[PDB]
Amino acid sequence: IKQGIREVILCKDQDGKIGLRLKSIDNGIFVQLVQANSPASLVGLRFGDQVLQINGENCAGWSSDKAHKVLKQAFGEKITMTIRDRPFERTITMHKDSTGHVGFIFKNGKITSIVKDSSAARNGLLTEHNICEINGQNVIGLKDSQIADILSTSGTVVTITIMPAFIFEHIIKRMAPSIMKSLMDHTIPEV
């Protein structure tokens, strides 16, 4: 979680698209979906990112409709955005043991129990928290089995990014689980 605010410059692709859906939460604007191979993934936009400004206008109190409308009517040759990095999220670092465990159970991306004298226990992993990323890779709406797979095929150091269930469930609301699985950027970022 980068310790505040950064500017991004976007250029609409050939189809006039940036690869972004937005959601009104608590009178802010938050990233609900970043589409793979889009302008929004290139410049590094993330699920849970807050959009403070679009072309130097404040997003405070905008509807999801209005945020999308503004993006539609932008001479998209160039779009500035002011971003606060995933303000609703936290990052926890764990170390696998002998039997290759970090020591929780999760269902539908949501951590449901922590396991006795584990790295998850030692590091204060919380339950009722949705898994948003694993080693910087967005994992939102992958099956649980594929989440297990990123963890097995990960280094002995494991860096998980979590969001409280209540807030998770308010962001992804009115977004079909198919699009989550299908279209959300799940790639390692490019250099």
Curated annotation (Swiss-Prot):
Principal location: other
Protein residues bound to a 1,2-diacyl-sn-glycero-3-phospho-(1D-myo-inositol-4,5-bisphosphate): 108, 143-144
Tissue specificity annotation: Expressed in lung cancers, including adenocarcinoma, squamous cell carcinoma and small-cell carcinoma (at protein level). Widely expressed. Expressed in fetal kidney, liver, lung and brain. In adult highest expression in heart and placenta.
Swiss-Prot/TrEMBL induction comment: By IFNG/IFN-gamma in melanoma cells.
Record's keyword terms, sorted: Acetylation, Cell junction, Cell membrane, Cytoplasm, Cytoskeleton, Endoplasmic reticulum, Lipid-binding, Membrane, Nucleus, Phosphoprotein, Repeat, Secreted
Membrane topology, as annotated: Peripheral membrane protein
One of the record's GO molecular function terms: cytoskeletal anchor activity
Domain called PDZ: residue spans: 7-86, 91-166
Mutagenesis or variant effect for residue 107 to A: Disruption of the cooperative binding of C-terminal peptides from FZD7 and phosphatidylinositol-4,5-bisphosphate
PTM summary: Phosphorylated on tyrosine residues.
Protein origin, superkingdom: Eukaryota
Location(s), subcellular: Cell junction, Focal adhesion; Cell junction, Adherens junction; Cell membrane; Endoplasmic reticulum membrane
Gene Ontology CC: one annotated term: nucleoplasm
A GO BP annotation: positive regulation of extracellular exosome assembly
Quaternary structure note: Monomer and homodimer. Interacts with SDC1, SDC2, SDC3, SDC4, NRXN2, EPHA7, EPHB1, NF2 isoform 1, TGFA and IL5RA. Interacts with NFASC and PTPRJ. Interacts with SDCBP2. Interacts with PDCD6IP. Forms a complex with PDCD6IP and SDC2. Interacts (via C-terminus) with TGFBR1. Binds to FZD7; this interaction is increased by inositol trisphosphate (IP3). Interacts with SMO.
Task performed by this protein: Multifunctional adapter protein involved in diverse array of functions including trafficking of transmembrane proteins, neuro and immunomodulation, exosome biogenesis, and tumorigenesis. Positively regulates TGFB1-mediated SMAD2/3 activation and TGFB1-induced epithelial-to-mesenchymal transition (EMT) and cell migration in various cell types. May increase TGFB1 signaling by enhancing cell-surface expression of TGFR1 by preventing the interaction between TGFR1 and CAV1 and subsequent CAV1-dependent internalization and degradation of TGFR1.
The protein's name: Syntenin-1
Organism, as annotated: Homo sapiens
Organism lineage: Eukaryota, Metazoa, Chordata, Craniata, Vertebrata
Included range, full protein: 108 to 298 of 298
